[PDB]
UniProtKB/Swiss-Prot annotation, chains B, C:
From-to range in the entire protein, with total length: 77 to 277 of 295
Lineage, broadest ranks: Bacteria, Bacillati, Bacillota, Bacilli, Bacillales
Acetylation among keywords: no
Annotated GO biological process: regulation of cell shape
Coiled-coil residues: 1-36
Subunit and interaction comment: Homooligomer of 24 subunits, arranged as 12 dimers.
Record's keyword annotation contains Coiled coil: yes
Keywords noted in UniProt: Cell shape, Coiled coil, Signal
Similarity annotation: Belongs to the MreC family.
GO CC terms: plasma membrane
Job of this protein: Involved in formation and maintenance of cell shape.
The protein's name: Cell shape-determining protein MreC
């Protein structure tokens, strides 16, 4: 099994890797042809490790070994290879606190986009400990969603680069008012056990519309 | 071990593909119409912020004062006019969209036809998703499909910018003018790359 | 006494007004495009029957065999192509509409563009209200708004008949061709006056 | 009162009368400019009187003094100045039976159109003795209707001329399936007391699509 | 024989039709021109050149000749079989086109 499937995978994986690199290069040329600098998807990453996590508030917060003097700033996105895990909240000289998507803070939110033949925008806001699902609120009521669509950061909140993978639509429903839809999402990154992590500095100019 | 290493960063890769594809297509479309409007002295910008609260009213771009961006300048995409610059900052600016709910928001328009009629675009319906073209000559006849562009009467926008298509047409109460309802050409729900027209010469 | 005499026949009068207005407008539109297609030898007809059961598939017109109407002839309105004649009778005939659900219903189409691409219109979605334009060249690029007309390849319809507008465009599975979704120009939900093109010379 | 309102009415009535006549003439010219004969709205009327009505089936049927030898034929529309009242069902040499809109025959129906900035089509089918309302079934589910819109004959059933006034939308609702709408209509013609009536021969070719 | 190998082609004719060259038969020694407009008519001998649609090759490069033409199953398009102009069995001197301007 340790080579029965990864043969068709680690292989079909490099498949997407080169496809990207090509698109990624083409995209770079286009933006150069036009006068486009610091687009909404660009960013400078910084690697870091979780150095402390309290079981009392395990799903709310984590502490990393990088801080102010390393360039870390409040509101920077924090991720892992398989997805978005949170944002920097408070920073010290050499360490910082990051609030996880699974946090119980009702004010916690992130601007997101649901990829489809036609994209839709909404706000991720709310985690359910039982269902293990993120709430995607305010999607257009007339657009139709299917289980499996990918959700990524829109960057429209002004602080995260766009394109970071968040998760997958798992369930969809209409809200009481009948004005919008709400999708429930399965985070792609596993946040129960965090060790190695990456803090993203957003390149695009900061937005004040929030 | 490497059974999760390059296995998890999969969905992230499929997402990069999808996003790059769309951004490349849109960016290509931008290149073609380049020389097509080189005269208006174009400035390419990115939408860097949009609030869900007033989603249809405005958007923020990463170009401002120090880039030649000044309030009232036209903002467009390859498929259409999307708005005008309002408040400007040093490195960014706010753009009022045609889909705005601000009742004072207006744009001088012309219907391309045998005979050219002028009108004021002023009003957007969230439901029908149509733009209101008020004040057209009461006895002139319009047909579904006629193209609507900016008139230029007012110095603000250059003339010739495509706005949308005549969808419906009706006579208002007074019996003095006609109102056409227009399908915007540009898609303003999903904005990313945008163009500021600095000069209307 | 006369308090009901000319009082009741009121709503009936207001109805005559509304109906005549619409019929006059549509009829005027017909006159303008007259010489515009005098070559195709037009035959003006009225829809005389339509069943709610198969509303979107067909319609019956008051012209047939003894009028020169023959199956496969194009049927149109000022704002667009609406179908083709199928079974014909002495004084009437059945018209298959573009909105039909008959999967075998097809029309050869051409997209007017820098480079002209041909495709087959084959399929209508009741929900999106869009026509399926299949088989367009995989590497040619299409933009929302390009006009689609009949190609003529097949002898059936004359070429140049306006069909609709490119709304969306996508690549099919195979990766061999593209499919555009089209907004029909003509309104087929409300048909009354119609035109049969007898000759495609 | 017998001249306090009819002064502003019989006057404002001739108002619509001349407006029509003008449109009506213009329409005639247009149809002549194009080669349009026997359009969907043309017809030859015949005057008649109700000569018998049984209280046992008062709302189902009525008998008129014109028949076969007068040109009356089954399926011809029967009206009065204020609206449509029914259709001819069986004919004899000098008299005929006409089924009223208020009939209890569930199979009874008429193709209709709801006038609006954008017309809608449906089938009138069913009368409620209590509410005194006609059922307009199968109107498009996404179109919106307002109380007061006029309903007329569409002619699409192949037997009536189009344009005969039927009544007014009074109530509107969505059906269980959620596929269409149903409007309830107030007949314009009062069918409780019928005397003078008019049988319409349809000019347009007959339709077999029914 | 690489099934993913493709080239965008155009048939020079009264009306120009586009298609994708994708497939070579060792036996008939013919190139497969897929996706041509179903109701357009092609004749043996029409010349096929590169279309350029895709930025890769310059347009106008001669590819071969229409030999046979047939309608595929679907009844949506036509496939022509083409006789390559160049002889690829014996290659020695060759030319690389650096710019497609």
């Amino acid at each position: 099994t340790e080579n029965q499937h990864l043969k068709e995978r680690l292989e079909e994986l490099a498949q997407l890797e080169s496809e990207v690199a090509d698109l990624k290069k083409e995209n770079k040329d286009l933006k150069e042809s036009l006068d486009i600098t610091d687009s909404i998807r660009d960013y400078d990453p910084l690697n870091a490790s979780v150095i402390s996590r309290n079981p009392t508030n395990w799903n709310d917060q984590v502490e990393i070994d990088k801080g102010s003097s390393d360039g870390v700033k409040p509101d920077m996105a924090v991720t892992t290879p398989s997805g978005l895990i949170g944002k920097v909240t408070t920073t010290g000289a050499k360490s910082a606190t990051v609030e996880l998507l699974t946090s119980s803070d009702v004010k916690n939110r992130v601007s997101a986009k649901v990829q489809g033949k036609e994209n839709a925008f909404g706000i991720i806001n709310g985690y359910d400990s039982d269902t293990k699902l993120l709430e995607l609120k305010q999607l257009p009521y007339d657009m139709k969603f299917k289980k499996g669509q990918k959700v990524v950061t829109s960057g429209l909140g002004g602080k995260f680069p766009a394109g970071i993978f968040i998760g997958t639509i798992e369930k969809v429903e209409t809200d009481k008012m009948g004005l919008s839809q709400t999708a429930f999402i399965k985070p792609g990154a596993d946040m129960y056990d965090l060790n190695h992590v990456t803090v993203l500095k957003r390149s695009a100019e900061a937005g004040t519309t929030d």
